[PDB]
Amino acid sequence: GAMAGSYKKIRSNVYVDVKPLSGYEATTCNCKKPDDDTRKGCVDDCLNRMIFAECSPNTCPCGEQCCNQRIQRHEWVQCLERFRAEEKGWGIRTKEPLKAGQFIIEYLGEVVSEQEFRNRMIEQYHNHSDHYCLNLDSGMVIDSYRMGNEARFINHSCDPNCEMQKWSVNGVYRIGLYALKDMPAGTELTYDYNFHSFNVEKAQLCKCGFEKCRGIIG
Ligand SMILES: C[S@@+](CC[C@H](N)C(=O)[O-])C[C@H]1O[C@@H](n2cnc3c(N)ncnc32)[C@H](O)[C@@H]1O
Ligand SMILES: [Zn+2]
Ligand SMILES: [Zn+2]
């Protein structure tokens, strides 16, 4: 019955220490442009998509027809609701059905180096009953304890319907939430923290309720 955790809402990532630069030359896929405004360009066949790179809109042969610029264009689903999830504080659920592979929302926050987060863990996060952090890349981490978006309220499940994917978006790695399977309306979005989130030494009881639930968060 406790109120939701305060944070400052952001529209894009905040780079505190480092930049999550990827070593990429995005963008010379061998995609063919289709003809109808409603036959999308670059499908999974796309060579940028294959290596989780988004096309650039300046160089993509499909132009304004390419459907592989979801993160940079912020093509988030507009049907999320934060809600009281039993035994798991607050969570996020979709209000409309989603489909496997569908991009849902970007995970936002303060991008910090591994060590900066560790310091933060001792000076400020030692009395916390909730943990808001994803691994990004090479010792870098997206911290949403303070600044973030509604993706910070997404809970863990040992049998998840969603996953975090790391994409290079015009040279920078960003993390988005994507559907793993079809999900109907009202469904609580979940991903596996073990794989995606940063480990804390402090264990919490898992309540995901899967038959092979690990019993532990982390
Ligand atoms: C990223 S926050 C998610 C939002 C959080 N439920 C809240 O009320 O702000 C992660 C925290 O939520 C709780 N949590 C997430 N998944 C859980 C689960 N499967 N079982 C029990 N608690 C969970 C834990 O307290 C964890 O530290
Ligand atoms: Zn493209
Ligand atoms: Zn579990």
Curated annotation (Swiss-Prot):
Residues 24-75 form the AWS domain. Residues 202-218 form the Post-SET domain. Residues 78-194 form the SET domain. Residues 7-218 are annotated as: Catalytic domain. It is found in: Nucleus; Cell junction, Tight junction; Chromosome. Widely expressed, with highest level in brain, heart and kidney. Histone methyltransferase specifically trimethylating 'Lys-36' of histone H3 forming H3K36me3. Also monomethylates 'Lys-9' of histone H3 (H3K9me1) in vitro. The physiological significance of the H3K9me1 activity is unclear. Belongs to the class V-like SAM-binding methyltransferase superfamily. Histone-lysine methyltransferase family. SET2 subfamily. It is linked to Intellectual developmental disorder, autosomal dominant 52: A disorder characterized by significantly below average general intellectual functioning associated with impairments in adaptive behavior and manifested during the developmental period. This is Histone-lysine N-methyltransferase ASH1L. It comes from Homo sapiens (Human). The gene is ASH1L. The chain holds residues 2074 to 2285 of 2969 of the full protein.
